[PDB]
Design an enzyme around this catalytic site. Structure first.
Site, PDB file in Angstrom:
ATOM      1  CG  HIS A  32      -1.934  -1.194   1.211  1.00 17.11           C
ATOM      2  ND1 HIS A  32      -2.700  -1.597   0.052  1.00 17.11           N
ATOM      3  CD2 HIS A  32      -2.077  -2.377   1.978  1.00 17.11           C
ATOM      4  CE1 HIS A  32      -3.711  -2.540   0.188  1.00 17.11           C
ATOM      5  NE2 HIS A  32      -3.266  -3.266   1.418  1.00 17.11           N
TER       6      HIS A  32
ATOM      7  CG  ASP B  63      -4.317   2.397   0.280  1.00 18.49           C
ATOM      8  OD1 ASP B  63      -5.673   2.149   0.540  1.00 18.49           O
ATOM      9  OD2 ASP B  63      -3.476   2.430   0.651  1.00 18.49           O
TER      10      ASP B  63
END
Ligand SMILES: O=c1ccn([C@@H]2O[C@H](COP(=O)(O)OP(=O)(O)O[C@H]3O[C@H](CO)[C@@H](O)[C@H](O)[C@H]3F)[C@@H](O)[C@H]2O)c(=O)[nH]1
Ligand SMILES: Oc1ccc(/C=C/c2cc(O)cc(O)c2)cc1
Length: 440
Positions: A14, A109
């Site tokens: 991530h 995200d």
């Protein structure tokens, strides 16, 4: 200089893509970046190395720890609850940045969608940076309608899903959290997907030439879907420490080496490693294999010595972009993580796809049956890929006709990648178009 705030989900797969987007934003435009990192634990040595290596225009802040005692499963659920229990800390951090600076955007995200209404309230437009494929984005926007239409577990649907503009996709190949509809991971994925609609815009690390159908569909099928901006490929430059890799690749003929790498998170049994070894050996092809533990004492008796002339074994880590961009490198046996896939695309290196987790099974089907830039081994009943099958598909890639057709198609995608990221490319232009709206 306007500030962009980026909130990565915890975890390195991530953080690294969002750090890469950050390096792009501050190189190409007049912006500073502040990374706010929710955490389940104190900083890693890995996090601090990556974060302290960034340009000065990118500041970072670990947020107060969420107590891991007050999180009672799948990583999707843990990520989601970390974001939830950090909402207060981010609101507070965001409030203080907003008064001391011009905050022109929030970027998260696919698990940070709890922040979108918070950012809107404060007059900050929130964007989703989607780190996987347009096809995967389309799959996810379609999932709530699919959830109502189909009541069986998706692997039990004998017919494929045919998203407009996309290769057919059997249920067994849907993303990991969709493979048990009773687990909380499925319910959390649906909750986040339902909020993608709250984004000002969605960046996707892809390009028109790579996924014309899924992008066409995403951008026309629904007013409900926000603007979607293909701005890829965005990949690490690979100009960092390390490694006999390059010295060794220099001694090999053009397009003769199979690079073999499952990522950090890609874990194989000792039985499967040993079948991979015998398979590489009996293929007769040259290989560079990043050998992660099930130093090489667990490998088949005699193997290390028998392949001294044609293969290099690297413990733990290799400079992937340097390997893939070397002219010795003819192929890539990969787990089909999107960042690895993009690196291989921009360097014209065709693949053997061996998906392990997340959306990798969906990436493999796209790469193998859609773009036709990948071959695929067959597993035996138990899920083990046998030495004889590894040898067959390695030979097909490195010396066979299917390999030649894959190499050709992948070199064409390579040329599109270079073009779309050049001064007048569709990707360079579109990101400039969206960023300029922030600049005022
Ligand atoms: O020996 C090595 C091994 C790796 N690397 C580098 O690490 C990165 C690997 O990214 P990759 O997408 O393959 O894995 P991961 O970070 O788990 O991606 C997740 O997130 C992806 C989407 O963001 C998703 O598609 C994927 O399934 C997830 F796993 C890439 O930048 C390589 O160059 C290296 O330098 N040396
Ligand atoms: O620890 C973790 C690290 C990464 C991930 C990624 C999950 C994921 C799930 C999807 O449906 C699509 C996608 O692109 C990614 C999950 C847990």
């Amino acid at each position: 200089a306007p500030l962009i705030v980026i909130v990565p989900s915890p975890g390195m797969g991530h953080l690294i893509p969002l750090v890469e987007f950050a390096k792009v934003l501050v190189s190409r435009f007049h912006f500073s970046v502040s990374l706010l990192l929710p955490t389940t634990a104190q900083p890693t040595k890995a996090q601090t190395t990556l974060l302290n290596s960034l340009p000065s225009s990118v500041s970072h802040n670990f947020l107060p720890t969420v107590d891991p005692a007050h999180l009672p499963v799948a990583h999707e659920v843990t990520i989601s609850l970390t974001h939830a229990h950090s909402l207060s800390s981010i609101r507070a951090a965001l409030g203080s940045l907003a008064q001391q600076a011009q905050v022109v955007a929030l970027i998260t995200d696919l698990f940070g969608t709890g922040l979108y209404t918070v950012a809107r309230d404060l007059g900050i437009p929130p964007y989703l940076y989607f780190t996987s494929t347009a096809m995967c984005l389309l799959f996810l926007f379609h999932l709530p309608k699919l959830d109502e239409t189909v009541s069986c577990e998706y692997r039990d649907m004998p017919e494929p899903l045919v998203l407009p503009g996309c290769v057919p996709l059997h249920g067994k190949d849907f993303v990991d959290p969709a493979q048990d509809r009773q687990d909380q991971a499925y319910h959390v994925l649906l909750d986040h997907v339902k909020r993608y609609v709250l984004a000002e815009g969605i960046f996707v690390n892809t390009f028109v030439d790579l996924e014309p159908g899924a992008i066409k569909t995403l951008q026309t099928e629904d007013p409900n879907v926000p603007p979607v901006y293909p701005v890829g490929p965005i990949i690490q430059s690979g100009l960092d420490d390390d490694s006999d890799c390059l010295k060794w690749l220099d001694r090999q003929p053009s397009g003769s080496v199979l690079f073999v790498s499952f990522g950090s998170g890609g874990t194989l049994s000792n039985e499967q490693l040993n079948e991979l070894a015998i398979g590489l050996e009996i293929s007769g092809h040259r290989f560079l294999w990043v050998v992660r533990s099930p130093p090489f004492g667990f490998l088949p008796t005699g193997f290390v010595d028998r392949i001294k002339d044609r293969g290099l074994l690297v413990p733990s880590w290799a400079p992937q972009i340097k390997v893939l961009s070397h002219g010795s490198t003819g192929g890539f046996l990969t787990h089909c993580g999107w960042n690895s896939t993009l690196e291989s695309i921009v360097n014209g290196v065709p693949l053997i796809v061996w998906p392990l987790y997340a959306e990798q099974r969906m990436n493999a089907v796209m790469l193998n049956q859609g773009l036709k830039v990948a071959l695929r081994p067959n597993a035996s009943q138990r899920g083990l890929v046998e030495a004889d099958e590894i040898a067959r598909v390695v030979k097909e890639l490195m010396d066979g006709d299917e390999g030649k057709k894959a190499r050709y198609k992948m070199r064409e995608l390579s040329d599109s990648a270079k073009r779309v990221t050049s001064e007048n490319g569709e990707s360079t232009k579109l990101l400039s178009e969206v960023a300029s709206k922030w600049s005022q």
